[PDB]
Amino acid sequence: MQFLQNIPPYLFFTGKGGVGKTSISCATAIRLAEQGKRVLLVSTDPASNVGQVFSQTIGNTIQAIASVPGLSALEIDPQAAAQQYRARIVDPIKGVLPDDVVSSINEQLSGACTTEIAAFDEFTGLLTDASLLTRFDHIIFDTAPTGHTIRLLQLPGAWSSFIASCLGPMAGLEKQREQYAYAVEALSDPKRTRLVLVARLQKSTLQEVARTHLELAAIGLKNQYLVINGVLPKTEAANDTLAAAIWEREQEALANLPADLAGLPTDTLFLQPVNMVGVSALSRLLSTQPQRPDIPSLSALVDDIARNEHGLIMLMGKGGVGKTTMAAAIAVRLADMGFDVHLTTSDPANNLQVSRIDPHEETERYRQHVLETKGKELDEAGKRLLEEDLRSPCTEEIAVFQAFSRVIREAGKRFVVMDTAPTGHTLLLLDATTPMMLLQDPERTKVLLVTLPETTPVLEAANLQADLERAGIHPWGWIINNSLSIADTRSPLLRMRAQQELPQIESVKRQHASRVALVPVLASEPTGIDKLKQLAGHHH
Ligand SMILES: Nc1ncnc2c1ncn2[C@@H]1O[C@H](COP(=O)(O)OP(=O)(O)O)[C@@H](O)[C@H]1O
Ligand SMILES: Nc1ncnc2c1ncn2[C@@H]1O[C@H](COP(=O)(O)OP(=O)(O)O)[C@@H](O)[C@H]1O
Ligand SMILES: [Cl-]
Ligand SMILES: [Cl-]
Ligand SMILES: [Cl-]
Ligand SMILES: [Mg+2]
Ligand SMILES: [Mg+2]
């Protein structure tokens, strides 16, 4: 693998939940420890499972991995780090400022943004500890900071400005400005840091990764490698329509990578029949050469949704899980059964009217607004700090939700279906200053969580649900999209993967959701009403 060659001391893997960052990191560590290198594997995930893969426990203390001489591990808990970040700022004012005030300040430090800043504080400590490179040849991280977090920390305004906002976290920066600048130099130095962009052969993901590449390079991280994971080996595309349609779909994408990633050294890793749970399994991942559950169809959820003839239906979930596709499929079925439906989308690509809002224009409107509102009196460094804060992922969600709010009032006379929604955290924040009760009322609004029959994706969906719950919003149901167990295939590899889904689909059924739907992988893309209708399955 090109990414495995002459690696600098710091190795970072970035990419969406479940693309394979941790798996690839563990396999990389083993491989390097076996070449005689001293390796430190830094587990960064919220519910770390790294200990599991090595069949041993690991904590916030460096420990050698008994089963792999040369390798040690360290777990940095992000939820714990944000918690302490929050406590450092809030504890001094408890019993001082009135309870509602403290509670408001506390909520401002409970979003994904505070968690990212806290994670960076953790990354910074490791990146600045020169002693580490005295004991280790390489330190591998299974996540990486975002361009947004890095830009925030490099802005002069962050160290001299006082102003829905996510800058509250800044107040908690543990270290001196010099250490963060140092950490940033370490990240931008190709002789010290290598960044691996992990992706899947799917047109959508590739575009997101392309964007990530441009943001990080723009900041100075130009030592980047592209690793395409889970690729279907051609062999499997023999004697099977799905495996062939899939193999065909990835191939097109593989041969038509987005221009921005074309010049990057690219390696591909084949799809494995079993979720790697040991060293042999892990190491097999770097190789250069190669029955159903009892869950209702989407039709079923839609059937129960139709019951009251109207209402607000909101599809939520992480990026790329299928919110827009599911929302489309829901609106089509409702419309097809005589109900009045109004579908709203943020993605540019009768008795059913569709509204498309342009995220960019809404964001910019909303941005212009918060700028004249909170920007006055701020010097220029302060305005740039504020502008960068308006570059958080939540800024867009707020702006788009803002726009969808125009037609959310129609949920009273018909069905309004939205393909995206803000977080519970953001909702709470917006409600501090918006139709909160509407969203909280179980009748009027039905929140659907879209996810995948995979480990990380399920955990991420569960965390999004816990957060909505804090905001008094209970998800009405869960939709497990792209399932193989529900799809028909004779491909042994595929059926093997379908089997790997069972545990995840089970944890959703008996722990996360009351109402659950299973949607099959359709191969290609459900772009036409036909395909869209095919996802639902039949009545009764
Ligand atoms: N090429 C692959 N083939 C088959 N399974 C894979 C591959 N890469 C990862 N996985 C499996 O997928 C899950 C995806 O996870 P992980 O590597 O935890 O990614 P992330 O850290 O990006 O969430 C695990 O259950 C895992 O063992
Ligand atoms: N069941 C499915 N079968 C095949 N492709 C799917 C399925 N669900 C989603 N996709 C495809 O996946 C992408 C994932 O997207 P999208 O539904 O736009 O989700 P989101 O709105 O959550 O980002 C699009 O390329 C899409 O058409
Ligand atoms: Cl946030
Ligand atoms: Cl936050
Ligand atoms: Cl932030
Ligand atoms: Mg991980
Ligand atoms: Mg979408």
Main CATH class of the largest domain: Alpha Beta
User: Whole-Å distance between the termini?
Assistant: 50 Å
Largest sheet: 8 strands, mixed
The distinct ligands, each listed once, are: adenosine-5'-diphosphate, chloride ion, magnesium ion
Number of strands: 15
Characterize the overall form.
globular
Protein name: Arsenical pump-driving ATPase
Catalytic activity: arsenite(in) + ATP + H2O = arsenite(out) + ADP + phosphate + H(+)
Keywords: Arsenical resistance, ATP-binding, Nucleotide-binding, Plasmid, Translocase
GO molecular function: ATP binding; ATP hydrolysis activity; ATPase-coupled arsenite transmembrane transporter activity
Explain how this protein is built.
The protein is of the alpha/beta class and 540 residues long. It has 2 domains: 292-536, P-loop containing nucleotide triphosphate hydrolases (Rossmann fold, 3-Layer(aba) Sandwich), CATH 3.40.50.300; 1-290, 3-Layer(aba) Sandwich (Rossmann fold). 45% of the residues lie in helices and 15% in strands. The chain contains 22 helices and 15 strands. It has helices at residues 21-34, 50-53, 78-90, 99-107, 112-128, 132-135, 147-154, 177-188, 203-219, 241-255, 259-262, 279-284, 298-306, 323-336, 359-375, 380-389, 393-404, 424-432, 436-440, 455-470, 492-512, 529-536, and strands at 10-14, 39-43, 63-64, 71-75, 138-141, 193-200, 224-231, 266-270, 311-316, 341-345, 352-356, 415-418, 445-451, 477-483, 516-520. Helix 21 links the parallel strand 14 (477-483) and strand 15. Residues 111, 113-114, 166, 169 line the site of one chloride ion.
